[PDB]
Design an enzyme around this catalytic site. Structure first.
Site, mmCIF file in Angstrom:
data_model
loop_
_atom_site.group_PDB
_atom_site.id
_atom_site.type_symbol
_atom_site.label_atom_id
_atom_site.label_comp_id
_atom_site.label_asym_id
_atom_site.label_seq_id
_atom_site.Cartn_x
_atom_site.Cartn_y
_atom_site.Cartn_z
ATOM 1 N N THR B 1 0.958 -1.169 -0.480
ATOM 2 C CA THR B 1 0.222 0.078 -0.107
ATOM 3 C C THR B 1 0.979 1.568 0.029
ATOM 4 O O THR B 1 1.623 0.781 0.378
ATOM 5 C CB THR B 1 -1.309 -0.205 1.333
ATOM 6 O OG1 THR B 1 -1.450 -1.680 0.959
ATOM 7 C CG2 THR B 1 -2.391 1.492 1.176
ATOM 8 N N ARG B 29 -10.846 -10.588 -2.725
ATOM 9 C CA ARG B 29 -10.611 -9.765 -1.329
ATOM 10 C C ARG B 29 -9.905 -8.472 -1.507
ATOM 11 O O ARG B 29 -9.108 -7.922 -2.258
ATOM 12 C CB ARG B 29 -9.409 -10.171 -1.073
ATOM 13 C CG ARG B 29 -9.554 -9.830 0.949
ATOM 14 C CD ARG B 29 -7.811 -8.814 1.013
ATOM 15 N NE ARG B 29 -8.083 -8.195 2.305
ATOM 16 C CZ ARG B 29 -7.279 -7.220 2.425
ATOM 17 N NH1 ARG B 29 -6.849 -6.692 1.263
ATOM 18 N NH2 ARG B 29 -7.370 -6.993 3.880
ATOM 19 N N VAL B 30 -10.811 -7.589 -0.849
ATOM 20 C CA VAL B 30 -10.929 -6.187 -1.004
ATOM 21 C C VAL B 30 -10.673 -5.596 0.350
ATOM 22 O O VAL B 30 -11.198 -5.963 1.285
ATOM 23 C CB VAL B 30 -11.764 -5.184 -2.102
ATOM 24 C CG1 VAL B 30 -11.540 -3.865 -1.736
ATOM 25 C CG2 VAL B 30 -11.892 -5.887 -2.979
ATOM 26 N N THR B 52 -2.917 2.703 6.119
ATOM 27 C CA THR B 52 -1.884 1.594 5.649
ATOM 28 C C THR B 52 -1.719 0.420 6.953
ATOM 29 O O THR B 52 -1.619 1.098 7.805
ATOM 30 C CB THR B 52 -0.919 1.615 5.182
ATOM 31 O OG1 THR B 52 0.236 0.543 4.781
ATOM 32 C CG2 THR B 52 0.207 2.587 5.880
ATOM 33 N N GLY B 53 -2.691 -0.692 6.409
ATOM 34 C CA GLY B 53 -2.333 -1.790 7.286
ATOM 35 C C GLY B 53 -3.094 -2.688 7.118
ATOM 36 O O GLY B 53 -3.330 -3.074 5.688
ATOM 37 N N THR B 54 -3.937 -3.377 8.209
ATOM 38 C CA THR B 54 -4.681 -4.649 8.264
ATOM 39 C C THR B 54 -5.877 -4.540 7.348
ATOM 40 O O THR B 54 -6.981 -3.659 8.560
ATOM 41 C CB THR B 54 -4.473 -5.417 10.089
ATOM 42 O OG1 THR B 54 -4.960 -4.893 10.427
ATOM 43 C CG2 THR B 54 -3.120 -6.172 9.590
ATOM 44 N N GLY B 55 -6.197 -4.435 6.266
ATOM 45 C CA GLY B 55 -7.202 -3.862 5.576
ATOM 46 C C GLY B 55 -8.309 -3.773 6.660
ATOM 47 O O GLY B 55 -9.508 -3.027 6.478
#
Ligand SMILES: [Cl-]
Ligand SMILES: [Cl-]
Ligand code: NA
Ligand code: NA
Ligand code: NA
Lengths: 158, 135, 135, 157
Positions: B1, B29-30, B52-55
């Site tokens: 990201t 996956r989104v 930015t990180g664990t969506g």
């Protein structure tokens, strides 16, 4: 009081796991892109044009997980997502699950400006962008041996 | 990201975010990156944000809109909004990562709860600062 | 679009939304219905919401999460939050439609700024109300 | 205190152009679904199971633009979207752009409960659902004369 900030990803960047030479390449890429944004802002470029150009450069840079240098899916494919939002109009454009567009952020911006939609996905997003002259690319252009070795490591983990 | 936020000379805020997602992702996956208010938000009245990180956690918490709502309705400053989202609310949901944010007054924040976030910022006509690790 | 929100006997809130989208959309167009905080949101501390109408504006305005944030951080009642979002902010951005909402105290609201909204509600062990037109 | 609300869409509905015979069709459909939800709630069923079932019944109902009775795209196709969120855990599941799943809200609940993910799209969502035993349908099952006429009317300029 014009200003820019950028990021290339948050995570488990471990000092004991990085080389200095890798750290220097990251610093150089980040400094080169932020300076381009500063120069655009100083010349009176719009905040929308600035964020669009900076993300386009972060896409193009193979060190960062967006555009060229994207991570691999479970199936050794690339599926890319992007968003842009204009704080003046509150307009926004986004694409998700695209494989055949070199620069998702530019497609996201095309959705914002040339569609009555905010979000487009997959082949529909691609066909919309190709109809307006964006180039269709092979998703192999995004592939890097670094992210591939990360896919193998992730598979060994489980 | 990757992502960017900016305040231009005309007082306008904008944000943009792009990703390839997560290594070994399930196809289809989104994450938060293309979702307005989750991975990307801008409003001239409040803030521009790129995450930015664990969506999954950034979606469930609407992290980018949460910064805006905390300032606009909660009266929090950018620094206080960033603290509450990134260091309290996201970790409480099992969320790790960070975001970049500029408010309508030109304040800038680059909070992250992880070991690192690749990042840089600079004022028009000043020298840029780049970062990898904490401090 | 269709939707449901419920408060159960254990004090849990939930929301669900489903749609075909908008007639003659471009293939690949996504509206607010599958985006957390745009067309669907539930939080036991605040509210459960399901939206219907001009999806693009519900995304830009984060309509469902905005109800929750106006209550949580702004101290607004369900009735005030619904008025603010559906009758002022959505129409200011060119949006039309409505939503259904239940807060954690079991207040219910079915605001819409259109001519009609196919809708119904009722408390457990009680007579339901159905509606198509205004009032 | 336990309560359910449902909706079947907001838009331009003029009494002027609507038959009472037509209005009673919508009222009866809405009454039957809200009463199913009310009876599940009083019987102690979760808020999550109640909204899942109500939206499944609204999808099934050809009068409403979800599932059977979905609108058409520009290309005479159906692309469906759904979301479900649990206010107890703040867990959620969503599908977008699905054409081969009968009940998008059931697919969305499967993303919530049988994946670590929140959102799945397109053929990827469909493959994830098939892998968990959800049946594959032809999108022609969603098609109705009424929504087809509204597509032709939309393409008039
Ligand atoms: Cl550093
Ligand atoms: Cl009525
Ligand atoms: Na890149
Ligand atoms: Na239906
Ligand atoms: Na459709």
């Amino acid at each position: 009081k014009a200003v820019i900030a950028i990021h290339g990803g948050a995570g488990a960047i471990s000092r004991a796991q990085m080389s200095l030479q890798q750290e220097l390449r990251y610093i150089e890429a980040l400094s080169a892109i932020v300076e381009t944004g500063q120069k655009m802002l100083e010349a009176g470029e719009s905040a929308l044009d600035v964020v669009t150009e900076a993300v386009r450069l972060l896409e193009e840079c193979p060190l960062f997980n967006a555009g060229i240098g994207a991570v691999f899916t479970r199936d050794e494919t690339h599926e890319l997502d992007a968003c842009v939002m204009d704080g003046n109009t509150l307009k926004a454009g986004a694409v998700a699950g695209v494989s055949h567009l070199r620069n998702p952020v530019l497609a996201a911006r095309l959705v914002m400006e040339q569609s009555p939609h905010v979000m487009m996905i997959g082949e529909g997003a691609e066909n919309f962008a190709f109809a307006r002259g964006m180039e269709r690319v092979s998703p192999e252009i995004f592939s890097t041996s670094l992210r591939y070795e990360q896919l193998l490591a992730a598979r060994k983990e489980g | 990201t990757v992502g960017a936020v900016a305040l231009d000379l005309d007082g306008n805020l904008a944000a943009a975010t792009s990703t390839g997602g997560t290594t070994n992702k399930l196809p289809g996956r989104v994450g938060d990156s293309p979702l307005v208010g989750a991975g990307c938000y801008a409003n001239n009245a409040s803030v521009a944000v790129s995450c930015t990180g664990t969506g999954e956690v950034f979606i469930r918490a609407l992290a980018a809109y949460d910064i805006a709502a905390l300032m606009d309705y909660g009266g929090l400053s950018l620094a206080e909004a960033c603290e509450r989202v990134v260091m309290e609310k996201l970790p409480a949901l099992g969320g790790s990562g960070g975001l970049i944010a500029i408010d309508h007054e030109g304040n800038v924040a680059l909070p992250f709860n992880t070991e690192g976030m690749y990042r840089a910022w600079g004022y028009a006509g000043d020298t840029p600062t780049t970062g990898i690790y904490r401090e």
